[PDB]
Design a protein around this ligand. Structure first.
Ligand code: ZN
Ligand code: ZN
Lengths: 151, 42
């Protein structure tokens, strides 16, 4: 009752600039009501066709009621079930889902399917550190969530 | 780069040992996927 969501970050990876990237931006706009920011490759990676500094992904930060809602959609897709691996030592956590359509976005054969990354940074409604275990029982109590053993 | 997270939010790629920001969930050096991020299939 005294631990809150500070922000939810979302990210869709494509790997190169073009149609599929720009469509991943739209998906984030539809899903989120905000404009996403394109990410650039940190390194070129020959065997994956990645070039340094190329736009290759899109991300968006959401706060407040919007963040809670999107998180819930994500958790429902995951059936409210994460692993201890998903929880950082900082008291934050994240996870992925295979298909964005499962949040309730319509499938378009033109668009295709996107994987989606979630990262949730927690905070206190006020600087005392949030442990990995506090975030775990927060998730367990607030969402009746299940945290599978570490793999 | 981002004041709301720390290095403790970073994950270590087990293929090449690169420290990677929370997002994306593949390694920025070698592209290897992070383990136990996605739901496990049956
Ligand atoms: Zn990526
Ligand atoms: Zn790597």
């Amino acid at each position: 009752r005294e631990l809150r969501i500070r922000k939810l970050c979302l990210n869709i990876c494509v790997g190169e600039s073009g149609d599929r990237l720009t469509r991943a931006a739209k998906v984030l706009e539809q899903l989120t009501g905000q404009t996403p920011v394109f990410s650039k490759a940190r390194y070129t990676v020959r065997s994956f066709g990645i070039r340094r500094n190329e736009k290759i992904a899109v991300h968006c930060t959401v706060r407040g009621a919007k963040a809670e809602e999107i998180l819930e959609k994500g958790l429902k897709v995951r059936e409210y079930e994460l692993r201890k691996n998903n929880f950082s030592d900082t008291g934050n956590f994240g996870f992925g889902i295979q298909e964005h359509i499962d949040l309730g976005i319509k499938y378009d054969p033109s668009i295709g399917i996107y994987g989606l990354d979630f990262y949730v940074v927690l905070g206190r409604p006020g600087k005392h550190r949030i442990s990995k275990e506090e975030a775990m029982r927060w998730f367990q109590q607030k969402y009746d969530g299940i945290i599978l053993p570490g793999k | 780069e981002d004041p709301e997270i720390s290095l403790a939010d970073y994950w270590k790629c087990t293929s090449c040992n690169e420290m990677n920001p929370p997002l994306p969930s593949h390694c920025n050096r070698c592209w290897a996927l992070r383990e136990n991020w996605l739901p496990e299939d049956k």
